[PDB]
């Protein structure tokens, strides 16, 4: 150790190089690297000097590597590296003649930027995004693609989100990168895109205009949950936008894909997200709702609303209820023919107060259609009221006149007064 600190501070390149390699090796260990202990040895500022030794690309590389391993540590370890001015240097190193140095500068910058939004915004401020995207072309080796994408994803990560104007140029690169077959690149790219599509519809506008939609729908069927999860997030974000933005996704047969996500034995978290995604499509027009009906999603949807875990039931209710909101008279009768009345009634006693309002709202839209059929047939009774009554739904609503919440209170009264006088 005292020979390490010394050679680092020496004038001899041999001494300098061995010591840095040793420190690097010291910091390169897998189980609890001695990061606190390499900083308090006072070589960190000397490591930052070695980064500028363009004549000694090996020392640069080794120094950048030890600095990277230091910045993988605690928030403080990262704040020390920043304070010694390494951020602009690593960005300058992205223009290195050496490929090992450029790849390491990327990994370093990803580590600093991964620390916090604060650190992310400084790395972006030192102009790291533009020299980063220039390292990506038709000849970029896989190791660098993994490094660069993981870094690009971290530049985008974080709450509050970075300016969209700052992260926008990275969109063309990410749009290419999702065409890779490498799981790691596909993983980080989709996470990166899931961050950029999260926000206002003009952000979603930028994302679909970059042309990612077809490939994203394919990644729904990726065998790895590591790729499916961020891809499902992105696709879900896109369909929270308008009808036309939602259409870019529907156009590439995503509904049959989402259908299979609910049917195969997958994690609750995944099934829950496909349903939230499905809910934002039945939150669309009569034809987007028709696109869902056509794929055969209602059938399985109802089954989930009836028998699935409550984190899934919550989202299946929203899908079903939203469909009654924008749907036609006939589509709505199809939802009832698939047997959605009973599963909607059963949730009027769930402890989640928002859900109860959603089912109640969905049940009322069913009631209005049944009311129109009662007039068209000049009948005595609303057929759908009889079904709601049959599902023990009439008694639940009668009891919701006892609810503590005014939103729920006023709607139960409204429903009973409009359909049960």
């Amino acid at each position: 150790l005292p020979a390490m600190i010394g050679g680092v501070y020496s004038d001899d390149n041999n001494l300098q190089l061995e010591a840095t390699t040793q420190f690097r090796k010291l910091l390169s260990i897998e189980r609890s690297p001695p990061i606190e202990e390499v900083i308090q040895s006072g070589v960190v500022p000397r490591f930052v000097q070695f980064l500028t030794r363009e004549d000694f690309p090996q020392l640069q590389f080794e120094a950048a590597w030890a600095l990277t391993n230091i910045a993988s540590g605690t928030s403080e370890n990262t704040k020390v590296v920043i304070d010694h001015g390494a951020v602009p240097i690593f960005v300058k190193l992205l223009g290195s003649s050496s490929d090992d140095v450029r790849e390491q500068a990327v990994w370093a910058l990803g580590n600093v930027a991964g620390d916090s939004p604060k650190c992310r915004d400084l790395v972006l401020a030192n102009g790291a995004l533009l020299p980063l995207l220039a390292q990506l072309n038709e000849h970029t080796k896989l190791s660098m693609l993994r490094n660069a994408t993981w870094t690009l994803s971290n530049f985008c990560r974080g709450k509050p989100q970075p300016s969209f104007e700052q992260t926008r140029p990275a969109l063309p690169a990410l749009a290419r990168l999702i065409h890779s077959n490498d799981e790691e690149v596909l993983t980080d790219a989709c996470w990166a895109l899931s961050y950029l599509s999260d926000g206002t519809n003009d952000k979603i506008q930028a994302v679909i205009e970059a042309g990612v939609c077809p490939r994203l729908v394919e990644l729904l069927l990726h065998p790895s949950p590591s790729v499916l999860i961020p891809a499902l997030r992105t696709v879900g974000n896109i369909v929270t936008g308008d009808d036309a933005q939602t259409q870019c996704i529907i156009d590439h047969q995503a509904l049959p894909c989402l259908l299979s996500l609910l049917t195969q034995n997958l994690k609750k978290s995944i099934k829950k997200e496909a349903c939230w995604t499905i809910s934002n499509i039945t939150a669309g027009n009569k034809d987007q709702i028709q696109a869902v009906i056509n794929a055969g999603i209602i059938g399985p949807l109802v089954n989930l609303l009836q028998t699935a875990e409550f984190d899934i039931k919550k989202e299946a209710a929203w899908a079903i209820s939203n469909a009654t909101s924008g749907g036609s008279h006939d589509q709505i009768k199809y939802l009832v023919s698939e047997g959605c009345i009973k599963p909607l009634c059963d949730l009027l006693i769930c402890p989640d107060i928002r859900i109860v309002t959603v089912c109640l709202e969905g049940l009322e839209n069913i009631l209005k259609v049944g009311e129109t059929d009662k007039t068209l047939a000049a009948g005595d009774v609303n057929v759908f009221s009889q079904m709601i009554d049959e599902a023990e739904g009439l008694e639940k609503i009668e009891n919701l006149q006892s609810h503590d919440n005014n939103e729920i209170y006023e709607k139960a009264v409204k429903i009973l007064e409009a359909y049960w006088m």
Binding site: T240, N280, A283, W318, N322, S325, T357, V358, E361, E407
Partner: peptide
């Protein structure tokens, strides 16, 4: 009023 799109 309750039903619609969700971010």
């Amino acid at each position: 009023t309750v039903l619609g799109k969700r971010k």
